[PDB]
Structure formats: C-alpha cells, structure tokens
Design a binder for these strands. Structure first.
Ligand SMILES: [Mg+2]
Ligand SMILES: [Mg+2]
Ligand SMILES: [Mg+2]
Ligand SMILES: [Mg+2]
Ligand SMILES: [Mg+2]
Ligand SMILES: [Mg+2]
Ligand SMILES: [Mg+2]
Ligand SMILES: [Mg+2]
Ligand SMILES: [Mg+2]
Ligand SMILES: [Mg+2]
Ligand SMILES: [Mg+2]
Ligand SMILES: [Mg+2]
Ligand SMILES: [Mg+2]
Ligand SMILES: [Mg+2]
Ligand SMILES: [Mg+2]
Ligand SMILES: [Mg+2]
Lengths: 104, 88, 117, 67, 237, 70
RNA sequence: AAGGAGGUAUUC
RNA sequence: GCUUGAGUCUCGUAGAGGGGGGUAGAAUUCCAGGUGUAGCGGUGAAAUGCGUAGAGAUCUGGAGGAAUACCGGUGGCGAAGGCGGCCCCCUGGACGAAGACUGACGCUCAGGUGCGAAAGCGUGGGGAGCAAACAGGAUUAGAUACCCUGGUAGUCCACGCCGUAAACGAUGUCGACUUGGAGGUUGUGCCCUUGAGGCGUGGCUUCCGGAGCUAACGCGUUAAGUCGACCGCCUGGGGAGUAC
C-alpha cells in the first residue's frame, strides 16, 4: 500500500473540531483496512504570510498507509470542507514513526 | 510497469521452474502482458508520444523473439501463440 | 489639518521621474510632489537633485499636519532614489524604517521588446 | 565549504525542520546558492524542494513583504 | 482609561496605561461582533486607545482590559430582537463535515447540525445542495449567549409526510403498499412518499419471505407500530 | 530589505546599512534585467559565453602561477 | 562610476 | 552444442522524460470604492497620448489571463524537436551491485511508418501582457525604417492540417583497439569514519593535451587516430533547389 504524509491546516475558529476531524479521518482510513503510523497535532501556529486574511492556523500532521482510493476520497473532503484552509498530501517511499521537529 | 508480483506469476506459468526467467516463452509472455496493460493507458492519453515510443520497442521486440522461436522450435511457437492469444 | 506625527513617505523612483507621496499609516495621502512639477524638464527631470527638490516641496506642503516621525518606502530603480531619503531626513523628520518595496514578478508577464537604437 | 548534510549523512532534508532551513534562506527569503553555502548538489536539490514545500504550507515566507 | 499599545499579540493586545503598567486586551475583548479580526488590523503598536479596566490581577501584575464595553454586544441585541423560535435568514459562510456555520446580522455565527436538513437524504446530496455563500432561512432553535453559539434549524420549515402519515393512519389501520425491497429478515414496503413500512418475514406469510414477496408486489399489511428512531413502520398481515 | 533604525546610530549609518542590504538582495540588477524581453536563445547564449570566458580566465591564471614571466 | 585587497573563496 | 554479443528476472538510485488533474505566491491589466491634487507618460530633445467628468501616486476589495523570481549549475533528463513553481494519478527510458536464466535470439536499413521548434491554415473557445499589419508623433535631403504613443491577427486552450529551421557538434548508426591530466554529475566496494579522510571500481559529461591524423585551422579514448559492417550523399560558380 502506498504511504502518504498528510498535512492540513484547519481554520483557527474550529480548533475545537480538530479532535473530531482527526477521529473521523482516522476511521475513514482504518475502515479501508489502511494503517496510521503517525499522528501529530502541532496546534495553533503563526503563519508566515496571511492565508485568506488569516494568521494563526491550526496544524495537523498525519502519516498514513492506505490505498489510493480512500486517499482520493479524503482529498475531495478537504476541498469541500471550508474549515481547512490548505492541505497537502505527499507520497513517501517508506513509513515514518518518529517525532517531527515541530513536536521536539 | 509490470508489478513484482505479476512478473513472478507469469514466470511460473511459462517456465520450467521458478528461476527460468529468461526463456523465450517467459519473455514473450511478459512483453504481451505489459503491452495489453498499456492499451488502457493510451485510450485516455493519445498525446503521450514519449511513452508510446517505449511501447513500440516492446511490440517490436516481441516480434523478434517470436521469429526466433518459430525458427528454432515451431511446436513451442504454435503452442505459445495459441496460449497467449496472438496472431503470428 | 489634523495632527498625526507618524506617517509613511512613499518614494516612486522611476527612470524618468521621481514622485514623492506622504501618507498616514492607513494609506490616505496627505500631499505629493514630483520632480517634473518642481521646475525640471527632460534631461534635468531625471536627476538626483530634482528628486531632492521634490522631497523639499512635499515636506513643505505637508507640515500643516505636524508629522514628526517618518517611514520611508523606496520603489523603483530611479535616478535619485536616495536624495529623497536624505532630503526627508534634513527637512526635520525622524526616519524610523527604510524598506525597499520594488515589485519583482516571480516570472510573470512578458516585458516589452528591446530597443534597437 | 563543508556541506553540512553530507557530514551527518542525512537521507532527506525533511521540509518540516524549519530551524535548519532558516540557515539556507536569506533575509529577503530567497534561497542561498550552493556556491555560497558549500552544500553538495544532490542535497541542494532536496533543500530547494523542501523550502518550496515549506513556503506552500506557510512555514516559511516567499518574500519579506507579504504584509 | 487611555493607554498606548506597547505590544500586539494574536491572543491579546498590550496597552500601557501607566508608566510600568501594561494591561492585556484580549482579542476576545477587542470586538463583540467579529471574534475573528486579528489585532494587527484594528490597532497598531504605539496607538493611543481608550480602554476600560475590567479586572486587575495584583498578584500576577496583569490587568484585563475591555475595549468590549465601548462597543455593543450583538448577542444582547439579538436576544432583545429575536425570541426563541424566530426565523432568521443568513448566508452560509462555510460548510463543514459536521454542520453549517451561518452568519446572522450582528456578526454572529449560527451552527446548524446536519441532522436537521432532511429526514431521508443520506450524506451525499445534502452537501451538493448548498454552496458556500448561499442564503438559507432557519429558525433559531436555541441561543447560548454564555457559549456564544446559536443553534439554527431547518426541520421546522418542512412538514414531514411521515408525521402526517402516522397521524392519518392510527395504530391498527390496514395499509396497502408496494414492496421496494425484499430481505431474508423482512420486506421493505413503501406506503407513501418518504414513508416506508417494514413487514417482517415472520409476519409476511416459511423461512424466507422471498418465496412469498417479490420486489414490486403490493402487500396489504396492518400498521402495528412506528419506530420514530429509524422511521420504521412495523407491519403485520 | 527592511531596515530598522537603531538608537544612537547616525543617519549616515542607517543609509549605509540600507544600501548594503539592497545590494545583497540584488534588486536593481533584477529590475534592469526585466526592463526588456530577452529571447531564450539570447539568454542561453549569453550565459554560455560568460562560462567560457570565466573558465578561460581560470586556466590562464593557473598558467601564470607557473610560467616564468620574470 | 573611480581606487585598494583577497581569492576563484571561502573553513574562519 | 557453447557463453563472451544481445536479451530476461531479483534490489536500489538519480532525473525540467511524457500525458491528465489540482493548487500557490509574486507581478502586470481592468473594475469598485477611500485619501488627495495638477500633473503624468515618453525621449538624445520633443510631440502624439492620458488627466480637473479628478489622472498619475497611495490604500482596500474584486475579476481575469499568462508565466513560474531565488534554487540554477559548459548541472540533469530525452532519439531528435525539446523539457523549469508545488502536489497527486497514469506512464517511458537509463544506470549500479550480486546472483540466476535464455543460448547468437545480433548490427545496419532502400521503400514504408511515426515523431518533429517557430511561423502559418481550419473549426470552436479565450484574451492579462506582448505585438506583424495598421493609425498617429517625431528624426531625416527623403524614412513606406530604426525611436515614441496606441494597436488587430497571433501568442494561450481543444481538435485536425502543415512538415520546414544555422532542425548545428555544420561531425550517420553499430563494434573493437591506442599514452596522460584537471574537473562536474550519478552509483557502488574497501580501509582507522579517527572529523566532511584514504584507496578502488561502473555510467554520463566539460576543458587541456601526446602519438597519430589534417590543406590548414584543429581533432585527439565522447577522435577528425587504427580498423571492420551497413546506409545516405558529392562531382566548377551562376542559372537553380528554379522550370516541367
Ligand atoms: Mg519492459
Ligand atoms: Mg519603452
Ligand atoms: Mg506596446
Ligand atoms: Mg543525456
Ligand atoms: Mg526512408
Ligand atoms: Mg504555433
Ligand atoms: Mg488559429
Ligand atoms: Mg478563433
Ligand atoms: Mg511599437
Ligand atoms: Mg533541410
Ligand atoms: Mg536546435
Ligand atoms: Mg550549433
Ligand atoms: Mg545539415
Ligand atoms: Mg583538445
Ligand atoms: Mg520547389
Ligand atoms: Mg526554401
């Protein structure tokens, strides 16, 4: 199965929905028989430049082993959901199970 | 291209044993499988001339292998083209 | 007529001319002076001295507002581009920050064809 | 000289490490050439991709005067 | 009191009121009506602002300051204007996986739970019906001024044919319907537009109702019960 | 090239610091390059010529550290 | 733009 | 029959290779407002042009199209044309290490087929910037030009056609052999990695140079050297790559 690193930034006004979004997305991979290898909530962070007239976005990182179809559905959800200002999903050759420099 | 699992499956069918990866029948079957796979790709991407150039080498090379096989052992040539659903 | 004492001086330094505009932090213009309207034409309009006199006129047609601290933003590779900052400093203004704000496309629109003079 | 990454044998630059990348971007925010830094070419390309990915995520700024 | 802004942060604004005295103006205390305006846009560092002392922490040397009281709370303006049950029209600001945030007049964001948009459309058509910025009318179900949230509802604008169907057919009426689905456990029978009853195989006629009931057959079954949780009308012949 | 005027430093120092900052950014050179459109062949050709002359200078310099011109 | 230094340029 | 040429398989690596779809920031233009007022723009010098119906300048918001600063490199990939933001999907080739397998399956190629910059053509879209034609202002003895202000096709998208370039390394493809040096890039083995070290071994690539070759310039292990296989082309300049 392909390995994907998913970083998405949630609107700061919905910082209280971040647990819910994480649970929902996590289940939508685990149900498709994929794995979850890393879950990091970097939290509220200052943005380098304003995004949609905002600063201080909420950062969530996810490193995942899942098939291409479920990840495709996940990206479509990001587009439709207006709580995530930006998201990037990147393919990775192997899994990662170490703290990011942000957590450290 | 062809997956690591799909190559092993084809080698088993068309070879004397697991390690007979270079027999002409095995090579022709591998080329045929990739050629048949790629037709779906070119249905959606007509303008992919660079990739189609690699497709031609597979077609042309299968022709050369089949001609050699026909010359050297007609019986396997007849048997192989029937099994792989080929003309000539 | 009001009192601000903290404004921003935008210097537009083009090759042919030098426009100085003084404004508040919000971006509402208070006054403006240009080298071409300060008594200089053609070969003299695009000179560092002409920009200095333009800076003098703008600092003289704005002091009704009593500006005391100034922030300078330079835009463009003009001839003067510097005499304006010096002239502003000498006109009785405290210069807080200097910033280059020249616009640089990140490989966008196509520029005009080269001049074959 | 002294390519820093090859000294530690880093496999991939990992855009998330903002502390490292700040060394390789200038005050204005554009990337410093490998000629100045001393980085090897292979790591230089990885470094450029990492910085560009960080800019997209707004971990790093494109230019000094976004706002 | 009048004070000069010494430092601006995304969580609050520092206003020096007296020499050596800095009070913190929360960004939540900066504006009643738009909780989502960054301090960098309303006040600059060094601006002289009139701020009201809300709280003084002598022990921690911090003063909580209110710009809030110079402006007006739109929640009280909303509570005076809109009683419980008021119909408010508002623009869909954003669509989220759990519900729609609706901005009402006064800069208030109302939350509509997705469970109240339709009783019969699973998941996918409801998201395509509403585009960001569309104007939707909902009735104020509950205003929580303490948590600063308005729950809005669409359910009160419709009239459930299910509710009319159950009211029209009292318990014990024999109702005729066309079978839409046949399962090993029972048959799903549509009795009206959006009102479906369930006739169990043990009450359909034999271990399998498929031998007795085909998809599309009209079955006369007695309205024996309604499951208001699952919209399931338990039928018996 | 933002410049913050520190305390106790003269305005000449502030102007000097700003000038060096602009030079490091190389803004003026970029604007002069972008005044006119240079065809890709011209841009490609000009880059090649600089490399050729630069390499020749290094090798010629290398010979000078060896050949007895005295 | 003019003059001085270092290098192919920096480790510092 | 054989394994050394040519292939197949196992594990990795680097890459602007290709096609489809998203997205990001800067910038130009236009529009809607706020501030403000008499110039702006352009040139060797001017004028045409824009502007008191408020321009230019400055701030905020919006619309749209095109291209992707820095990295960037006689750096990389591709048969050539060519390919440069980031991300995903589909996909082609190349190289390396170790081992196994097939067993001459090879090289070249008239005709044939395909790909093939830019301009151009056809149908239908799109149109920010740029800009043949064209309009105007200048310069000039003249200026059907160079320079200035505008500006249509076109440049962009989809689908077809065209099939040509100083399409150039002005050097057909494939193989073997023949002294060296400095590098770049990408693998891999070993030694003390003492700390980016040292020593080998493959691929591609830039410069210098020996023998030799060359008319000379120069080429020089990536040959224009020594040879072998196959193919294309030349036969004084013009007429003419023109007529039929
Ligand atoms: Mg293949
Ligand atoms: Mg011009
Ligand atoms: Mg033009
Ligand atoms: Mg190559
Ligand atoms: Mg031919
Ligand atoms: Mg064309
Ligand atoms: Mg056309
Ligand atoms: Mg058309
Ligand atoms: Mg013109
Ligand atoms: Mg020709
Ligand atoms: Mg060419
Ligand atoms: Mg050439
Ligand atoms: Mg030729
Ligand atoms: Mg040589
Ligand atoms: Mg002809
Ligand atoms: Mg011709």
């Amino acid at each position: 199965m392909r390995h994907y690193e998913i970083v998405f930034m949630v609107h700061p006004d919905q910082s209280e929905q971040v647990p819910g979004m994480i649970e929902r997305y996590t289940a939508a991979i685990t149900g498709a028989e994929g794995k979850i290898h890393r879950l990091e909530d970097w939290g509220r962070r200052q943005l380098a430049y304003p995004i949609n007239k905002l600063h201080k976005a909420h950062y969530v990182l996810m490193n995942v082993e899942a098939p291409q179809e479920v990840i495709d559905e996940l990206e479509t959800t990001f587009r439709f959901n207006d709580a995530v200002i930006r998201s990037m999903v990147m393919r990775t050759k192997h899994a990662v199970t170490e703290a990011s420099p942000m957590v450290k | 291209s062809l997956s690591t699992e799909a190559t092993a499956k084809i080698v088993s069918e068309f070879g004397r044993d697991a390690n007979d990866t270079g027999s002409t029948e095995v090579q022709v079957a591998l080329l045929t499988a990739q050629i048949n796979h790629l037709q779906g790709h070119f249905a959606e991407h007509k303008k992919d001339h660079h990739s189609r150039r690699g497709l031609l080498r597979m077609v042309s090379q299968r022709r050369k292998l089949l001609d050699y096989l026909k010359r050297k052992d007609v019986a396997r040539y007849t048997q192989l083209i029937e099994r792989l659903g080929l003309r000539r | 007529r009001k009192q601000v004492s903290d404004g921003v001086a935008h210097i537009h330094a083009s090759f042919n001319n030098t426009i100085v505009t003084i404004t508040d932090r919000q971006g509402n213009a208070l006054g403006w002076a240009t080298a071409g309207g300060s008594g200089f034409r053609g070969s003299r309009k695009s000179t560092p001295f002409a920009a200095q006199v333009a800076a003098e006129r703008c600092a003289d047609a704005v002091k009704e507002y009593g500006i005391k601290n100034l922030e300078v933003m330079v835009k463009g590779p003009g001839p003067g581009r510097e005499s304006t900052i010096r002239a502003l400093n000498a006109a009785g203004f405290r210069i807080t920050n200097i910033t280059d704000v020249t616009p640089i496309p990140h490989n966008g629109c196509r520029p005009p064809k080269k001049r074959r003079v | 000289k002294f390519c820093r990454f090859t000294a530690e044998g880093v496999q991939e630059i990992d855009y998330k490490d903002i502390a490292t990348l700040k060394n390789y971007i200038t005050e204005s925010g554009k990337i410093v050439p490998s000629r100045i830094t001393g980085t090897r070419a292979k790591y230089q390309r990885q470094l450029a991709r990492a910085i560009k990915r960080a800019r997209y995520l707004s971990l790093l700024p494109y230019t000094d005067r976004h706002q | 009191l009048t004070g000069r802004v010494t430092n601006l942060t995304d969580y609050g604004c520092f206003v020096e009121i007296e020499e050596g005295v800095e009070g913190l103006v929360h960004v939540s205390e900066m504006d009643w009506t738009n909780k989502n305006i960054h301090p960098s846009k309303v006040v600059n560092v060094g601006d002289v602002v009139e701020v009201m002392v809300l709280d003084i922490d002598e022990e921690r040397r911090r003063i909580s300051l209110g710009l809030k009281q110079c402006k007006a709370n739109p929640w009280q303006q909303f509570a005076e204007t809109h009683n419980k049950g008021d119909r408010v029209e508002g623009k869909i600001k954003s669509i989220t996986d759990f519900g729609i945030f609706i901005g009402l007049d006064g800069g208030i964001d109302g939350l509509v739970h997705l469970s109240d948009i339709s009783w019969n459309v699973a998941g996918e058509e409801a998201v395509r019906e509403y585009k960001k910025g569309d104007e939707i009318a909902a009735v104020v179900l509950q205003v929580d001024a303490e948590r600063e949230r308005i729950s809005l509802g669409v359910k009160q604008l419709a009239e459930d044919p299910f509710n009319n169907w159950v009211a029209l057919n009292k318990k014990g009426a024999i109702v005729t319907g066309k079978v839409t689905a046949v399962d090993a456990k029972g048959a799903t029978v549509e009795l009206a537009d959006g009102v479906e009853g369930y006739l169990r195989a043990s009450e359909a006629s034999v271990e399998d109702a498929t031998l007795v009931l085909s998809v599309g057959d009209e079955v006369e079954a007695k309205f024996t019960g309604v499951d208001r949780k699952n919209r399931a009308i338990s039928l018996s012949v | 090239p933002v410049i913050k005027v520190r305390e106790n430093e003269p305005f000449d120092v502030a102007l000097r610091r700003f000038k060096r900052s602009c030079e490091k950014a190389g803004v003026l050179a970029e604007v002069r390059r972008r005044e006119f459109y240079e065809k890709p062949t011209t841009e490609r050709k000009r880059a090649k010529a600089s490399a050729v002359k630069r390499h020749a200078k290094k090798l010629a310099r290398e010979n000078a550290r060896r050949t007895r011109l005295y």
